[PDB]
């Protein structure tokens, strides 16, 4: 089972990725998490990527393609996988098609920009795993602590409204063309496409995706 999550940064892809992971037994592959690990490494390229991420811009195509190809060749990705935030440009999608990486579903999250900017205010993360909560719309069981480890939750410093809006400008310029790209693939029978209303509460977006999937 192979799935691509498509949508604006902050539309809720990582939140719903966890349920899909838990139910089909496939790993989540988040290029953002992979890049954050590269930053925490401390290479010059990790530093270069952190400077690009801090400005709300995309890292170079060829770098992220190479990181994904390495990640999907691992033993835990045999039975399938969920791509979260990749591909992110047309050249990234073309690299997948040219390499023969087919997928079963492409799932588009429909959320308006101003609602995204609103939601990120309350986001909290468990940094080591990257798990994501919201103080109102998806709170942890006991305040400020990750649910299955008990360690503290934190807030990313790259979640300033200013950086959020820069990611959204990047998204509409660079990433939204993938909607038309995969709509054409779906019309050719190369994957199934679906569009979900991501403005609903967390539990209802999950219920709509359960209806689509199988």
């Amino acid at each position: 089972m192979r799935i691509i999550l498509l949508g604006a940064p902050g539309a809720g892809k990582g939140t719903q990725a966890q349920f899909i992971m838990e139910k089909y037994g496939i790993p989540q592959i988040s290029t953002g998490d992979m890049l954050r690990a590269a930053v925490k490494s401390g290479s010059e390229l990790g530093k270069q990527a952190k400077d690009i991420m801090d400005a709300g811009k995309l890292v170079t195509d060829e770098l992220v393609i190479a990181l994904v190809k390495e990640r999907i060749a691992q033993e835990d990705c045999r039975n399938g996988f969920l791509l979260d935030g990749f591909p992110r440009t047309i050249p990234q999608a073309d690299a997948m098609k040219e390499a023969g990486i087919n997928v079963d579903y492409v799932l588009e999250f429909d959320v308006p920009d101003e609602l995204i900017v609103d939601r990120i205010v309350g986001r909290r993360v468990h940094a080591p795993s990257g798990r994501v909560y919201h103080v109102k719309f998806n709170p942890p069981k006991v305040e400020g602590k990750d649910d299955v480890t008990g360690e503290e939750l934190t807030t990313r410093k790259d979640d300033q409204e200013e950086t959020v809006r820069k990611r959204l400008v990047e998204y509409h310029q660079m990433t939204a063309p993938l909607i038309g790209y995969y709509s054409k693939e779906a019309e050719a029978g190369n994957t199934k496409y679906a569009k979900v209303d991501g403005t609903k509460p967390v539990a209802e977006v999950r219920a709509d995706l359960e209806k689509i999937l199988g």
């Binding site: 588009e108 429909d110 709509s183 779906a186 199934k192 496409y193 679906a194 569009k195 709509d208 209806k211």
Partner: protein, 88 residues
């Protein structure tokens, strides 16, 4: 038939814009594809599979339009649509 929407109607209008509504088909809808053009290039857009309404704008007043709604099962225009003709 189970994959074709029914009862497509214009439910609100201005001289240049309108809102359409339909009864969803029986199948699970992955997304809808909506097309419209003068009854000239045809325009197309999508809405989530959970919706049963859509807005169309930029219409010329007093002109006849054909509006078509496809419910997709995941493979683009893979089910037959329902259409309506409407003069603004």
């Amino acid at each position: 038939v189970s994959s074709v929407p029914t009862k497509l109607e214009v439910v609100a209008a201005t001289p240049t814009s309108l809102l359409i509504s339909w009864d969803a088909p029986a199948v699970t809808v992955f997304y809808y594809i909506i097309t419209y053009g003068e009854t000239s290039p045809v325009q197309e857009f999508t809405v989530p599979g959970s919706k049963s309404t859509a807005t169309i704008s930029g219409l010329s007043p007093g002109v006849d339009y054909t509006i078509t709604v496809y419910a997709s099962s995941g493979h683009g225009r893979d089910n037959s649509p329902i259409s309506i003709n409407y003069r603004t």
